[PDB]
């Protein structure tokens with residue numbers, strides 16, 4: 001798809017792009033943005049309006065292109081896996097994310113000293129991906145600890161990411177989900193799927209509708225709909241699971257509907273049983 | 279109980295209450311609060327003093343009432359389960375919690391643009407419950423990552439909530455505890471109980487005194503005093519536990535004193551044994 | 557070692573040290589620091605330059621000494637366990653860490669009210685240890701959620717601490733590691749060791765090179781090089797592990813090289829097998 005937006009970029013004096021903010025997708029309106037242009041000598045950066053036009057099926061070719069792609073995902077214009085992100089790690093700079101805005105990592109010690117004359121300097125994160133909410137708050141969502149949702153996360157209407165939840169870029173919820181565990185990059189969960197506290201979903205992997213991952217559980221395989229993984233139980237691709245009297249590697253149960261995975265507390269054996277009613 | 283306090287409320291131009299801060303319980307002193315009244319046109323809110331009087335045994339009837347109840351818990355005037363919270367979710371608004379203060383979720387994009395002229399806008403959370411410490415810091419407590427304690431948490435003197443700890447509203451510690459795992463809404467742990475790193479306590483559930491939940495453990499049943507759950511072991515209500523040669527569903531071991539729960543590493547069987555010395 | 561640095565201390569009106577910032581180790585240059593000296597009457601603190609000289613092998617004797625030691629670790633001048641920290645907990649004050657800077661816990665309610673006239677007051681943490689990044693950002697590191705790295709953490713070049721990672725003081729990475737779980741105080745992991753999401757390493761304990769702790773795993777013993785602990789599996793010192801037909805308490809497998817620990821999904825038995833290729 002040809003996608004375009006007008007945004008405001010933060011550039012170092014050597015021309016490295018620390019960030020871009022695109023408030024709206026597909027608009028040429030600049031009036032939100034002209035008051036934000038200028039030069040900050042304490043950070044040694046310039047903020048300047050840019051217009052970015054991309055082919056979402058092509059690999060990104062520069063830092064601006066990479067930033068627009070993350071915005072398209074978090075504004076929910078594009079779902080996870082629908083936009084080409086190949087090579088994005090190479091295009092994003094490591095940035096010090098502060099209460100004063102993004103700062104270059106090279107020379108940060110001098111930067112911090114300059115900024116400290118203006119007020120206390122707090123560093124929220126040092127990374128190539130910022131906190132999503134600092135660029136877009138999608139509608140119909142709650143996020144307890146907004147450090148734990150990267151820009152490029154897709155959070156469908158009706159999602160709650162609790163404080164223990166984490167959602168990486170190119171990942172998230174396609175419908176209404178309670179997310180209290182970790183959704184790795186490239187993982188999606190479909191409508192009504194709830195991820196219990198401290199649960200882990202490995203990234204290849206997606207879960208269908210109305211799944212339940214128990215607290216402290218783990219899922220290393222794709223699941224279909226109406227599956228349950230018992231609290232505390234980690235299903236790896238290599239786990240051998242007893243189903244109807246036979247052992248199956250979990251990788252072969254990928255995409256199954258209506259299975260409850262538990263570890264028998266008497267024998268210690270991993271079992272899967274049908275999820276009755278459904 | 280009749281409870282009353284004077285506080286300062288933040289109201290949208292449509293009269294929705296985004297927050298109330300009650301610095302003290304039971305006082306009519308306004309002199310801390312009159313300098314904080316006014317109108318913020320970038321957020322489109324008004325801050326105004328309110329006096330709120332409630333019956334803690336009755337269901338809350340409006341947003342102010344709900345906010346006072348959360349304060350009563352976190353100031354430790356009332357313990358968890360001692361105040362009626364029925365319907366509170368319906369009375370609290372979803373709010374964008376920023377470095378500039380609370381902001382309405384509707385229209386936040388315009389709000390963010392207005393505020394960005396004043397300085398970098400950082401969103402800490404988007405939720406119906408704020409961070410406790412932004413309203414009350416109780417005495418004798420440490421909190422590593424104060425994003426992870428909701429207003430309405432009760433943290434007794436001598437509590438440390440480490441960065442991996444999480445304490446929901448209507449929950450917490452009745453005495454001195456090291457909390458490095460998740461205390462769900464309506465869960466309390468009694469004096470000397472330590473919750474290990476990444477442990478999960480389901481919410482009906484409380485733990486007694488001097489309990490130890492191992493790292494990455496889970497507890498889905500009430501426990502009495504001097505119980506231990508091995509690291510990595512999740513006791514669900516349905517788990518069948520071997521105790522003195524017989525199998526018992528864990529729900530039937532609810533409230534037991536002096537049991538150590540472990541998963542036998544040879545057989546894989548969940549067992550409970552007496553906690554000797556005690 | 558004799559170690560010395562010039563820094564800027566924040567002192568209460570009773571002379572308690574809330575913090576010290578030492579921008580550089582071993583320098584007498586004050587020109588970064590003289591613009592930061594002064595008195596803040598809303599917090600009731602004074603900021604003043606100090607010169608601190610210590611013997612790293614001796615126990616710290618005052619709060620300034622304790623702060624310099626934490627800096628020496630996070631600037632990577634000293635590795636974990638190389639500096640004497642005995643009694644440090646007694647020398648650090650509990651502090652309220654705010655957007656305005658450190659504040660005393662005694663009297664914070666009055667402090668908060670004073671500061672609220674200047675702007676929204678946000679409390680990041682209440683603890684004896686601050687967030688490392690607010691004092692030093694070491695080179696070659698990423699940190700997703702910088703609430704989760706305490707000052708006194710040592711993060712070697714090439715380390716990424718993801719949002720689920722946590723690194724305590726006197727702890728961390730000796731080389732390039734992806735850290736998505738919890739590195740307790742006094743724990744180190746050597747080059748190429750990756751700590752999976754939600755994994756727990758107990759603190760006596762270190763891991764060698766190229767180890768892999770699966771998501772939601774736990775390690776209660778020292779490991780040598782090229783060990784793997786399966787996702788979801790917690791090895792406690794007391795766990796009895798089957799290796800080559802014999803049962804061994806895990807404490808006796810301390811420091812082993814090239815072992816893969818798994819829980820057999822059929823029998824529920826904890827086993828260790830050689831890590832083939834290596």
Ligand SMILES: CC(C)(COP(=O)(O)OP(=O)(O)OC[C@H]1O[C@@H](n2cnc3c(N)ncnc32)[C@H](O)[C@@H]1OP(=O)(O)O)[C@@H](O)C(=O)NCCC(=O)NCCSC(=O)CCC(=O)O
Pocket residue numbers: 164180195196197198213214215216228229230231260261262263264265266460461462477478479480481514515516517518527
């Ligand atoms: C595996 C399930 C789904 C099974 O539950 P069900 O309700 O289907 O079964 P149930 O009625 O308990 O049990 C039916 C029968 O199976 C037995 N049974 C159950 N589990 C067993 C096991 N592992 N081994 C042997 N038997 C077992 C019961 O004793 C009962 O036996 P009889 O037939 O003999 O009676 C559950 O235990 C579970 O883990 N749910 C996880 C939910 C969760 O953690 N939600 C996430 C939000 S909670 C959260 O996030 C916590 C907060 C936080 O962590 O921060």
Ligand SMILES: CC(C)(COP(=O)(O)OP(=O)(O)OC[C@H]1O[C@@H](n2cnc3c(N)ncnc32)[C@H](O)[C@@H]1OP(=O)(O)O)[C@@H](O)C(=O)NCCC(=O)NCCSC(=O)CCC(=O)O
Pocket residue numbers: 442458473474475476491492493494506507508509538539540541542543544738739740755756757758759792793794795796805
């Ligand atoms: C289950 C317990 C409590 C058992 O410990 P004890 O000290 O009572 O027993 P011990 O001396 O190790 O063992 C007594 C005997 O039982 C055997 N034994 C122990 N566990 C076994 C098992 N699971 N299967 C079979 N045998 C077992 C031992 O080998 C020994 O055998 P012989 O009799 O043959 O010798 C422990 O292993 C545990 O998990 N503690 C958890 C502590 C914890 O995680 N604390 C939280 C803070 S730590 C934390 O939070 C980490 C940081 C973070 O995560 O962020």
Ligand SMILES: CC(C)(COP(=O)(O)OP(=O)(O)OC[C@H]1O[C@@H](n2cnc3c(N)ncnc32)[C@H](O)[C@@H]1OP(=O)(O)O)[C@@H](O)C(=O)NCCC(=O)NCCSC(=O)CCC(=O)O
Pocket residue numbers: 182183184199200201202203236237238239240249720736751752753754769770771772784785786787816817818819820821822
């Ligand atoms: C234990 C291992 C390492 C084993 O893996 P390997 O690749 O060596 O083996 P494999 O090819 O799967 O399996 C070899 C043979 O062993 C069998 N096998 C494997 N596990 C078994 C078990 N537990 N019980 C019985 N059999 C088992 C397989 O079925 C296969 O059988 P046949 O020979 O019959 O074929 C793995 O499953 C694991 O847990 N890796 C953890 C990785 C991880 O979590 N990384 C952290 C980043 S991921 C993360 O952090 C998630 C994000 C987040 O949490 O936030």
